[PDB]
Amino acid sequence: SKGEELFTGVVPILVELDGDVNGHKFSVSGEGEGDATYGKLTLKFICTTGKLPVPWPTLVTTLVQCFSRYPDHMKQHDFFKSAMPEGYIQERTIFFKDDGNYKTRAEVKFEGDTLVNRIELKGIDFKEDGNILGHKLVYNLDNVIVSDYFDYQDALDEIRETEKFDFAAIALPEDGPHSAVIKWKYASGNIDYRYRMIVLRPGEGLAGLVIRTGSRKIVEDVDTELSQNDKLGCPIVLSEALTALVAIPLWKNNRVYGALLLGQREGRPLPEGSTTFRVNQRLGSYTDEINKQGNVYIKADKQKNGIKANFKIRHSIEDGGVQLAYHYQQNTPIGDGPVLLPDDHYLSVQSELSKDPNEKRDHMVLLEFVTAAGITLG
Numbered sequence: 001s002k003g004e005e006l007f008t009g010v011v012p013i014l015v016e017l018d019g020d021v022n023g024h025k026f027s028v029s030g031e032g033e034g035d036a037t038y039g040k041l042t043l044k045f046i047c048t049t050g051k052l053p054v055p056w057p058t059l060v061t062t063l064v065q066c067f068s069r070y071p072d073h074m075k076q077h078d079f080f081k082s083a084m085p086e087g088y089i090q091e092r093t094i095f096f097k098d099d100g101n102y103k104t105r106a107e108v109k110f111e112g113d114t115l116v117n118r119i120e121l122k123g124i125d126f127k128e129d130g131n132i133l134g135h136k137l138v139y140n141l142d143n144v145i146v147s148d149y150f151d152y153q154d155a156l157d158e159i160r161e162t163e164k165f166d167f168a169a170i171a172l173p174e175d176g177p178h179s180a181v182i183k184w185k186y187a188s189g190n191i192d193y194r195y196r197m198i199v200l201r202p203g204e205g206l207a208g209l210v211i212r213t214g215s216r217k218i219v220e221d222v223d224t225e226l227s228q229n230d231k232l233g234c235p236i237v238l239s240e241a242l243t244a245l246v247a248i249p250l251w252k253n254n255r256v257y258g259a260l261l262l263g264q265r266e267g268r269p270l271p272e273g274s275t276t277f278r279v280n281q282r283l284g285s286y287t288d289e290i291n292k293q294g295n296v297y298i299k300a301d302k303q304k305n306g307i308k309a310n311f312k313i314r315h316s317i318e319d320g321g322v323q324l325a326y327h328y329q330q331n332t333p334i335g336d337g338p339v340l341l342p343d344d345h346y347l348s349v350q351s352e353l354s355k356d357p358n359e360k361r362d363h364m365v366l367l368e369f370v371t372a373a374g375i376t377l378g
Contacts, residue, residue: 001340003084006110007036007067013043014116015063021123022055022100022133030063032366034115036081039069039370045361054123055137056364057315060351062092062104064117065296068347068370077342077375079300079307079331083138085110086335088306097324100126110332129313131323138316141351143294145314145322151293152186159262160188161340162282167240167263169195171207171249182207182259184236189263195239206234207259210247212241214256217247220270234263244270248279295373296347303378305339306332345374 002062016029032043045063052059066080080088087109094102106119126133143291145151160241169187173180182200184207198205203212210217219225222243231237237245244264249256274282288310296311314326319374333339 001082003081004078006084007034007081009037010035010065012114013041013045013064013116014111015045015119016117017063017119017121019119019121019123021054021102021121022126022128023051024133026053028052028059028063034064034067034184035077036067036069039067041067041368041370042365043368044356044359044364045364045366046359050362052362054094054132055135056139057137057141057313057353058094058096058102058132058325059121060141060353060364060366061094061313061325062102062106062119062121063366064108064115065347065370066108066115067172068372070267070372072376074345075373075378076340076378077298077345077372079333079340079342082338082340083331083333083335086333086337088334089332090329092327092329095326095328096126096130096132097326099132099323100124109336111139131317137323138318140316140353141313142316143314143349143351146316147320148186151286151290152283152287153188154290155283156186156188158286159260159279159283163262163274163279165189165262166265166268167242167245167261167354169236169240169261169263170317171200171259171261173202173211182211184261191240195236198235202302204233206236206245206247206261208303210249210259211256212250214251216249216276218270219245219247241265243267246270246273248276250283251276251280292346292348294349296349297344298346299344300341301332302332302341304330304332305341307342343375345372347372 007057011034013032013034019026022310027049030043030045030047031281034041060162070078090106092104102123103119108117131137144192152170160168167189169184171182173182184195184198242263246262248260250258250260296309301308309329311327315323348371352367354365356365
């Protein structure tokens, strides 16, 4: 269209933010380049008023989605670029779970040949020793739960619901200089956390057996079918009080990368079956689909001639943890001309944060990759 043509090459960016968070006033300035053919953003930000009172990652989301790579089959869904050069207004509300919130208004428009982001930001109700005002968040924007990357828990939950089981767990090997060890790392339906303390040498226990075998083990009754040595060698059974179980190898590039245990307790009988293949297909499919939790979910707002977006940002915490930031976002065009209104889709964002080695002021170097996805028709 008309707004498309402008982003064909590298575009300079100016960003300015005026902020008040719990009475703490501050200002931030940023500049860089955006390349929407790559979905790439390079920028540097400076706190020009002194020290930044909030952790830098919490402002990344606030500090130009018109630079997102839309593949050809999705160009019909750039509201952002369609609103150019007149620009658009981005209001947004960010609720930090169990802490304060940001209210932000931003103008994103072309000034000359420079794409510009001007922001007013008001933050309220923050705890003085909270993660934000206490700068307890780690310096990155990895939109992930480090402790359960891949989200076995949630996938495992689904497996437990779908295969009508009382217990689900995944065992994974961990290398070592001349040997390895298998541990039970992720579990659904667990009664203890003592399964977490199990350590198996290779080929030992139910997990080691399944991983060396690469074939399942079905146990319809533990007490009748498992020897005393069997139970001695398989501590997960007694630890989680199992009366029946099925152990399944997990297959990747034609290798067993782990073990999945499905468990019945209180004498409850084993239910039907799944062919290891289906089981592996699921947990593949479910994990892959659920890894989209951090993406930006865009939906049209026909009445406001614009769009709205939702997402959640996971901020790692110093000691281990996650601070949640729930984002509600409104985008309305500046001009009164025609804009493109899209079918629901999402944006995937990779964000990297660093520091300029010759910069004494409080700052943030930001590299970002953003692609649109979620529509496969026409």
